[PDB]
Structure formats: structure tokens, C-alpha cells
Design a protein around this ligand. Structure first.
Ligand SMILES: Nc1ccn([C@@H]2O[C@H](COP(=O)(O)OP(=O)(O)OP(=O)(O)O)[C@@H](O)[C@H]2O)c(=O)n1
Ligand SMILES: Nc1ccn([C@@H]2O[C@H](COP(=O)(O)OP(=O)(O)OP(=O)(O)O)[C@@H](O)[C@H]2O)c(=O)n1
Ligand SMILES: [Mg+2]
Ligand SMILES: [Mg+2]
Lengths: 241, 241
């Protein structure tokens, strides 16, 4: 059971452009992710999937695996599919490039889930959040059953707060562990109505009966989209040491 | 493949005491439901599960079948399990006692779904609704996959309208079709957190990985909850004549 990590790092960014080559305390964001990916046990390879060369050059610079990919992809998942075709593996882990504060142990937990249950198509992460945090649509909630299998993913605060005291929310940490086969019969997947309405690509798998299991971890640090928190990333990154 | 129809009709009601016996165009509400259930093809038995002797009598009064049950039942569902033990069948259909405007064909569509797939645990119904309606916490929304399997049931507008033009909604028509086995292991099922927050008992099935398939129908007539709705249906059913 070989497993590899893939890190999508497009240059073009609607919000903050060239977001991956951004300097977070001496290193380019993308590098922080790479180094951390390298610390994950059980992984045979760590690849960065890029579309622009200013990234590929940046990556090779620190000696990272730089595989060039199409500059047309509408989503990460797609770009990952293209890499699944050239880099052989049983398990693919997709780590976003805008999260320089990922926890190598969280990833290990994710990959362990895949290993503990071979029949599991996809694994992903989540963590508890206040009902105050579950209000913001930028935040994505997830609800699961006893087996931790995902029921649904939404921008709406689910479950609804009827008996509000009994409500418990879980943010969804956008990392995924895919079974090679899943990626292979993926391009054939048609976009679902919930997907397009919600603007959540993972719902394209649920539309197709493809089970996704969630794994809970501790409140994770901030991602990197808002240059405002970007100071907290640097401040937390810089402090972290 | 024997299938029976169960109609829970407890005497009690926070706003319409005796409700099952309320008069709509000449007959007590419960009768309407019964007569309509009797029109459904493929059903071997139509039973009314009650908790009161006055409710029992009335049903015997017009030639219907009745069965007394624990007056301490907490829910129409838990009342059904008790009937599952006395009346043998492979499929159980639970029709509400406060919905005299049920459509015999909708139930047939429901029973057919269970028959077309022996492996299906439970089947239910739904129907399209505007986003303006879906806003009401009072209305239970449901979202499904390509095979029409339910992903989640909530009072929150799901799917969330990120790209509203893509958001299409379904109101959950609360009728059920239970495979005998499902009812046999029901009392062992523990209440789920999502079920408690949203106050939706069907969510105790999903928490247990027990698939529920939804079938779409045309917008259904209203039930009898408050006396405004009572006069609301009374009218409808009279102008139908
Ligand atoms: N076609 C795409 C889309 C996304 N990504 C990658 O997926 C991660 C996060 O995606 P996202 O949050 O959507 O960032 P952007 O794609 O740049 O869009 P935005 O800035 O608005 O969030 C990043 O590593 C990004 O480069 C990618 O490689 N190729
Ligand atoms: N302990 C119970 C609870 C409910 N039911 C039956 O389940 C159906 C619908 O129940 P519900 O949706 O909960 O409506 P009500 O409970 O009657 O709402 P209210 O208390 O406000 O009248 C009705 O046929 C009702 O008689 C039952 O037989 N026994
Ligand atoms: Mg991002
Ligand atoms: Mg009612």
C-alpha cells in the first residue's frame, strides 16, 4: 500500500495572487507545506502540482518535487487526477498549498484511517467549532454518523439549532485521502445540483454514493487567504519556533 | 412480499384534543385517511394504531380495523414497532393520522420503491418547494443523491445558496416504508445528536447507516395540526367534492 502526498500550487489566485511564493518567515509558503509534508510518516513521495513556472522554479529551488500540470483545471481535485496518472500510488493525499500550519500528525491520522479500512474510498478531517463559528458561510460544516461517515457538507449551520443546547458543530478541514481507483473514475463524475449551489466540490462524490469518512482533530490554526490572518500565520509561524 | 399500512392515531393533541375524531365534510379525520389507505393497491391490511377506546370505537363504527396500543407511546414510530410485533408483514407503511388529503398513488409509488429494491431499508417521499418556502424551520428539507438516497434532513435551507440560481429544494413529505427487520432493531437504536438538535426522529436511522430512499411527488395537501389548518383542509376537501 504505497501512499503519496500531492500539493496543488497554482500561481493564479483570485484573492491573493502568487499566494504560494509568499514569504512566511524566510520561506515561501509552499515550502513550509512541503517540509511539513516530508515529516509525515508512511509517505513514499511528496509532490507539488504546479501550473506556473514561477512556482516550479521556486519549488525546485528548495529541491522540491516539481511536476508541471495543465493551467486550465477548474479545481484542485482535478489537478490531482492529472498527477494520479503519472505518479503511481494506492493512496493519494491532497494537501492544500495555502495552509502552512498543517499538523503532520493530523495527516498521519488521515492516512491511518485509509489503512485501517481498505474499503474506504475517501478520508477527510474535521474539528469542533462553536455555533458562532458555524454561522459564517466561509466556514464549512459537516455532520457524521456513529461510524464517522459524512452525512452532508454545507455552508448553512447544520444541524439546525432547534433545541440549540443539544447542537454541536464541526468545521471541515479541507484535506483528503483518495483511493487511486476513486480518482480514476472521477472525471466521469457529473457535477451535482447541491455541488453547484453550495459551491462545494466534495459533494460531487456524495452525489455518487462514494463514502467519505471524517476524522476529528484539535482546533487547527488559520489557513492563508485573508492577508489579515496572514499576519497571525507569520506571528504563529515565527512564534512556533 | 406482504405489506401492511399502519395509521397511528393517539387521542391526545396540544391544540386539537380528540383530533383523530375531528369532523371533515361529514366523517372523522381518521376515516378519511383509512378509506384512502384502503384504495392503495398491493396492501394486504390497513390498521389504525390507537391509544384511546373512543378512538378505537369510531373506527370500528365505520367498518375499519383497529388495534389498541400502549398509551405511553412517545412517538408514532415507537407505536408502529408495537404493531410490528402483533401484525406480521415484510413491509410496513406508516401513514400519519392527521393527513386526510393523502394521495393513494403517492403511497403506491412509495410501496413500489421498496418492492423494486429488496435491499432497501426505508423509503420516504418529498416534493419540490421554492427557496422562499425552504426558509421556514417548520418545513423539513431533504437533499439527495443520483439514486435518490437521502444525504441529510434539516430545517436549515439546504442546499445553501452560494450560487442561488443552482439551488433547488425539496420539502420532506413525512410518510415512511419500513422493512420489517428495520423495525425489529429499532428500539435498540440510541438517539443521535443531530436528531436532538434538529428534533427529527428519522435522523436516528441515518446515524445508524440505515439508508432511506426518497421518492418525488407533486406538492401535497396540508395536514391537521392547528384549528386554522383544520378549517384549511375542511375547505379544500369540500371543494374537491
Ligand atoms: N485549478 C486549481 C484550483 C486550486 N488549486 C489549489 O488549491 C488550493 C486552495 O484553493 P483555493 O482556496 O480555491 O485558492 P484559489 O484557487 O487560488 O482561489 P481563491 O484565492 O479565491 O481561494 C491552493 O493550493 C491552490 O493553488 C490548484 O492548484 N488548481
Ligand atoms: N405518542 C404518539 C405520538 C404521535 N402519534 C401519531 O403520529 C402522527 C403524527 O404525529 P405528530 O407529527 O407529532 O403530530 P402531533 O404529535 O399530534 O402534534 P401535536 O402534539 O401539536 O398535536 C399522528 O397520527 C399521531 O396520532 C401517536 O399515535 N402516538
Ligand atoms: Mg484556500
Ligand atoms: Mg401533527
Amino acid at each position: 500500500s504505497k501512499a503519496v502526498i500531492v500539493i496543488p500550487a497554482r500561481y493564479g489566485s483570485s484573492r491573493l495572487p502568487g499566494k504560494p511564493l509568499l514569504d512566511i518567515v524566510g520561506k515561501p509558503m509552499i515550502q513550509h507545506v512541503y517540509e511539513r509534508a516530508l515529516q509525515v510518516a508512511g509517505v513514499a513521495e511528496v509532490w507539488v502540482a504546479t501550473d506556473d513556472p514561477r512556482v516550479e522554479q521556486a519549488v525546485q529551488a528548495f529541491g522540491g518535487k516539481a511536476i508541471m500540470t495543465r493551467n486550465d483545471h477548474e479545481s484542485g481535485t482535478d489537478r490531482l487526477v492529472e498527477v494520479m496518472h503519472k505518479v503511481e500510488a494506492d493512496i493519494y493525499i491532497n494537501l492544500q498549498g495555502d495552509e502552512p500550519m498543517i499538523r503532520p500528525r493530523d495527516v498521519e491520522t488521515l492516512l491511518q484511517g485509509m489503512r485501517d479500512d481498505p474499503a474506504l474510498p475517501v478520508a477527510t478531517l474535521c474539528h469542533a467549532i462553536s455555533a458562532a463559528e458555524a454561522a459564517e458561510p466561509s466556514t464549512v460544516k459537516v455532520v457524521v454518523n456513529t461510524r464517522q461517515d459524512a452525512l452532508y457538507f454545507s455552508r448553512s449551520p447544520i444541524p439546525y439549532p432547534r433545541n440549540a443546547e443539544k447542537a454541536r458543530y464541526l468545521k471541515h478541514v479541507g484535506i483528503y485521502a483518495y483511493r487511486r481507483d476513486v480518482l480514476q473514475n472521477y472525471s466521469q463524475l457529473p457535477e451535482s445540483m447541491p455541488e453547484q449551489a453550495e459551491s462545494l466540490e466534495q459533494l460531487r462524490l456524495m452525489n455518487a454514493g462514494i463514502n467519505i469518512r471524517t476524522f476529528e482533530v484539535a482546533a487547527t490554526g488559520p489557513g492563508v487567504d485573508t492577508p489579515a490572518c496572514l499576519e497571525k500565520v507569520r506571528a504563529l509561524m515565527a512564534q512556533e519556533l
